[PDB]
Amino acid sequence: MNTPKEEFQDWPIVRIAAHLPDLIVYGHFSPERPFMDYFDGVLMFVDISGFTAMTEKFSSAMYMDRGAEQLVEILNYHISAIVEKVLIFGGDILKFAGDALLALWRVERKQLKNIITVVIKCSLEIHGLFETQIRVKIGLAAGHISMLVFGDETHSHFLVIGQAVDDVRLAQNMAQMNDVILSPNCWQLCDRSMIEIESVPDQRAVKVNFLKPPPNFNFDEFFTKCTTFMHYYPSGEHKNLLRLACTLKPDPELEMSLQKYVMESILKQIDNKQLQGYLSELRPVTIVFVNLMFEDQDKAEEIGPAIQDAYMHITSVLKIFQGQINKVFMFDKGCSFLCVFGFPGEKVPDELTHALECAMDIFDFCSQVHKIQTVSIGVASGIVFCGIVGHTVRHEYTVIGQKVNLAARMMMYYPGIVTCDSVTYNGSNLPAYFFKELPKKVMKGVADSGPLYQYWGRTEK
Amino acid sequence: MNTPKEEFQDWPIVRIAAHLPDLIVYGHFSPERPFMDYFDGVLMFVDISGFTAMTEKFSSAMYMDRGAEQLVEILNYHISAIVEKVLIFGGDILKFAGDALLALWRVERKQLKNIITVVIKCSLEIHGLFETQIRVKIGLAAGHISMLVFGDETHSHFLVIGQAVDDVRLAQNMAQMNDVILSPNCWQLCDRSMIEIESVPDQRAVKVNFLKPPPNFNFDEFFTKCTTFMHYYPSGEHKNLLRLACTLKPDPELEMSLQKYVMESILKQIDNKQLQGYLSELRPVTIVFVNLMFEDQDKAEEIGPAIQDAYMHITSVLKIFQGQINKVFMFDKGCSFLCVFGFPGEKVPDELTHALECAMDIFDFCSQVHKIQTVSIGVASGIVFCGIVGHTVRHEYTVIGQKVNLAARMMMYYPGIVTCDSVTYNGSNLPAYFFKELPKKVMKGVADSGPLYQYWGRTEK
Amino acid sequence: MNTPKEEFQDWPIVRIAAHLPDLIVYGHFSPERPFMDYFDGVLMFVDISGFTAMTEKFSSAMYMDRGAEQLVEILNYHISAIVEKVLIFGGDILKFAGDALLALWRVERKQLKNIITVVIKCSLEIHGLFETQIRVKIGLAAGHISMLVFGDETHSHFLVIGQAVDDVRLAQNMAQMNDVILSPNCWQLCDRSMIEIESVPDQRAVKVNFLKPPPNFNFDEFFTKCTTFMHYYPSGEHKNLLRLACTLKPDPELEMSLQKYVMESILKQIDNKQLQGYLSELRPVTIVFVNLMFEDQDKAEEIGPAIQDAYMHITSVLKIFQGQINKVFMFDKGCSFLCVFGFPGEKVPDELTHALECAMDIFDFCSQVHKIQTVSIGVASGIVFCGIVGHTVRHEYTVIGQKVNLAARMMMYYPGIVTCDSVTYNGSNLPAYFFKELPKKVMKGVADSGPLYQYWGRTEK
Numbered sequence A, B, C: 001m002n003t004p005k006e007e008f009q010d011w012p013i014v015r016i017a018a019h020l021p022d023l024i025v026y027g028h029f030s031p032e033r034p035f036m037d038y039f040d041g042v043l044m045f046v047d048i049s050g051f052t053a054m055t056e057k058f059s060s061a062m063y064m065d066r067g068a069e070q071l072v073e074i075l076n077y078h079i080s081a082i083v084e085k086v087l088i089f090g091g092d093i094l095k096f097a098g099d100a101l102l103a104l105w106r107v108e109r110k111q112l113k114n115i116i117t118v119v120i121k122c123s124l125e126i127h128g129l130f131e132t133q134i135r136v137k138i139g140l141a142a143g144h145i146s147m148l149v150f151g152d153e154t155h156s157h158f159l160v161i162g163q164a165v166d167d168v169r170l171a172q173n174m175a176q177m178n179d180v181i182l183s184p185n186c187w188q189l190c191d192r193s194m195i196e197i198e199s200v201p202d203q204r205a206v207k208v209n210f211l212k213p214p215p216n217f218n219f220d221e222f223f224t225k226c227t228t229f230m231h232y233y234p235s236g237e238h239k240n241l242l243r244l245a246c247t248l249k250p251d252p253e254l255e256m257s258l259q260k261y262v263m264e265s266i267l268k269q270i271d272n273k274q275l276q277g278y279l280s281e282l283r284p285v286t287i288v289f290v291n292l293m294f295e296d297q298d299k300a301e302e303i304g305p306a307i308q309d310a311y312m313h314i315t316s317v318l319k320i321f322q323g324q325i326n327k328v329f330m331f332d333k334g335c336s337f338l339c340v341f342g343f344p345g346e347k348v349p350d351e352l353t354h355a356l357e358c359a360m361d362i363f364d365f366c367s368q369v370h371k372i373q374t375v376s377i378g379v380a381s382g383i384v385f386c387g388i389v390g391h392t393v394r395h396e397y398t399v400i401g402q403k404v405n406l407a408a409r410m411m412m413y414y415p416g417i418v419t420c421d422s423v424t425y426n427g428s429n430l431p432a433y434f435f436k437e438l439p440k441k442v443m444k445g446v447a448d449s450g451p452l453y454q455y456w457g458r459t460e461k
């Protein structure tokens, strides 16, 4: 009696789970919104801005109309390598952006100390990938983490928040190229006998110079001990797999839950109803980057409802113009919605006037949501890269480009108002008194912004 | 000198052979029509109505426009498992429908007794797949089997017929969920020392309670002995394969013969000229279910010509409206043509009036074919699932849904006439005197049929 | 710590490199044009006209609209086998045409003798593939080879030229089915103790009857010795691969260089922006076969500039009508451009009048290029096969058909002028005095050409 080779693992539910972390795939929580949960862990923030800063040169005519295809190829080649290191060292990649990836090792509190050592080693091996031949910066933090899931009956989004999350962004902003920086609390909780550090000026964070373990220390044996605490580390018959999620079996109730996190045009490709290459493109879009700030940004029970309320309104306003929320994440300050007009074959006429009117509408509504202290919105239009970024087993649809960065910097450098770039201003052809011309500011990671404007709106008052 | 790994087995001819049984793939018979052949074997009829009865709930809004994709995923997940069991135990899957799969173990007559034991064990292992967590019913029969191949210069269709075929449907209709039922002759021919059964009331068929072989019996050794008689059981260098058909090599003459059994839109996907996901859909169609009854339905030499004559006319009438024959099979009584208006991008305007006129035309022609005793046609319109159902190595295009079942029950409960449902009647907007409103009947596996009508046609006489 | 299986090698750059030989993939030469380089090697010319001569019967209605799909399937099945033999014996397939494949073993001069023995054995094993059940003819040559790369900022093309190249075509034209023929110089340079030959009448070339090595000779050990001299023979960890090119990693600068050799519609499929089956078709096209002859066709420094000049003009004239250069190769005499109007969804109205006007324009320009002695152009229109021909790891887009052969024979049998077939003449509906009706010639591999015409052009003078 033959025993033929088990082959099939390429179900839609498996393809969907590539787009999500284990935190969500295996999370099994209520469909009520907002949903909040609390845990501890170590976070890793890998800044890949050195990689993503190549978008503008792939618009060069030297790439002969295959810019987007070449871009996605070289980006995924490098990012895949980082992703494998993360996954092999037992982390869960939570999210990708066009500057970073964020990864989590969730553990009970007593194991934080040893897990930090694992993440440090991982960090150093990631830096090792790029030593000779584009580099990265890594910030690490550890401690209490809150997860928030918000959405409606058809879409879901999640975020991690709290001091370990603020910490890992602060850690990462301090870092030079090739640094691994630990947050003060990560430093306080870590195994000091393992690692040699140095002070960072006016900073209680630290930099890791070396991992030098003791005489009898054996990282492989130490790692194996650590895997006792890693719920989903592939093992046994599945020890050849990067993720346990690759083994997911069809389950309609689970798939209904998971699909809500993924954009419809991505699901269409997953269902083999669209060419697998149609979403990689350099296309003109309008970014509407919305930032919400709160009295206290680490208090999920406080900020959860407010974000949910904002989300409900944002989605209804975007729906009108097939605008899309590409991503939500906590910025150094506040909760940010990266909204896009124009991307997977969703490209309206008058994109610009409507983008501005939608931004104003969002601004006016969110301003009156209880507990939202300040709303700020940056609007920028130009050619951006759109595509599925990451590894075959773990990847997300992402938008990368100078205009994306500019919209992000605008909403931070010009808080409390709706701003737009010159392409949006000039292109809207709205009467000029709908705007206020703004003072120029020197903005981190931005050169040659042209003139910036505030969208004042239709009335003087 | 390198010896690189032989990889290529994904030729079009291999993809085509997934759609067909070994009976046809390796059959090498004349292209003359009708063609009849005669043999002996054991049949297995696995009723999967418990699985296919989920179509209506995948039309729920809870599935967010991915009903058809989720449906096909969960259905193939379960059906694949059954298919593997069949294939490993050495059977040939002849056909899939939206209630059943039919499988054949063809052997010389002297081996029927031992092969029945193999099929019984297979049956019990199939029931074991679904014990804890939708179940199936299995009917088995054994004896003489006739094959009929009919068609024209561009299309072919086959059927198995005879008392073993009537037997296996009768066996299967007696079964409760989880039963394995043997036909009287299967019982007469089987190895009674192996199996413990019980009587079934007013039935010479039997139910299998247990397979309890003797002390020294070793199923693996018994199976190996049995494989001596299985012509195409994968073995040797190919013992890792589910089907020998996976090894087929390009052969234009063979491929010309095999392609005639497969629908053109399926061939288009096979040729990588259509997205691999375009044929899975919930779409509105009109089912025209045609049933032909004969004086004696086990006499191939008698019924072959008549079916061929009917086929020639049916195909010419369907051609006019890109109606399609989805399948042909022997129903409990008679030969049935499952015809579909609307499915792989073949969707006409006035689908309904034409479906009715085509049904009448078929009815009038077939009524005058010598040896056709009674023609009955059910016509029903609504949303049905359409898709490729089964395993990667063995699968067929199938239509599943309440309207498909309703058309089937209509043609059986209202013999001798053309009937239609309310959607067809009301939608045709034909004058009401073209119809006769029918008495309501309680029909097996049908609740809440609305009013049913007879299509009387254009004239009183 | 898991060590999961390295999987990914299906990058765009790898798919592109399937279309090119190692000579180009690993060539790393300047982007200046023309570029010339010089080396020594053994050439193998495998005539597959017996395979490609089946195109006309796949247009038969017996193939039911899947002619092109069946054709490409059976052709690639056989050609793949030849390609594997070539690659395993260490050759580089330079180019495919609809009559031949040309393969190169490039080595330092001192190794030519032993490499010829390797190629002879390869040749004999290729003949062995087809012994019992369409055959091939093989010509071999050895000696000095020049490579020419020409093109512009967005397209590149290469050619090998010189006496070893003229030799291998002459060798191949002498061959009967199943022969291996060596050029005089190949014979002069080869290891005579290994091989038994016979004279060929009025020919200093020879035919190989047998490879009979000495008593102690061990081909496997001899081959291993030979691999010392083969730069890219897969080995070590990659000894399971047919080509080292399968291991290429993303590299934007390399990919920009390589893509210029490949047609845009092929790149579109590579980028998963077009169905993988869309380019296999039987479609009507106009072939414009341009032949350029030179005082001395082995002098790259002489013919390089002239070809580059011709290329610049040809491409600008074709651009106007999305005509395409399918291939360039040295014909028995001269450099030939196989140009096509109509193929990957590039099909203009008035294809015919424009094809003739473009041919005349090319003829007039090339006639005045210094060092071009004679220009000849054949124009033929009809249904031709278009498709990707070869092995998964090494394949090219190719056009095959009686009209392709006819255009080729016209330009050789009617030198110095522009000729066209009857479909082109009649179809152009140009006034008849734009043409001259030509004497019929009996042309190698052509029966039933209808009347042929010269395109005289618009004026008497």
Ligand SMILES: O=[Se]([O-])O
Binding pocket: A094, A095, A102, A158, A159, A160, A161, A165, A328, A329, A330
């Ligand atoms: O707020 Se994000 O770290 O998911």
Ligand SMILES: O=[Se]([O-])O
Binding pocket: B094, B095, B102, B158, B159, B160, B161, B165, B328, B329, B330
């Ligand atoms: O009549 Se069917 O069992 O193919």
Ligand SMILES: O=[Se]([O-])O
Binding pocket: C094, C095, C102, C158, C159, C160, C161, C165, C328, C329, C330
């Ligand atoms: O001139 Se061709 O042998 O590439």
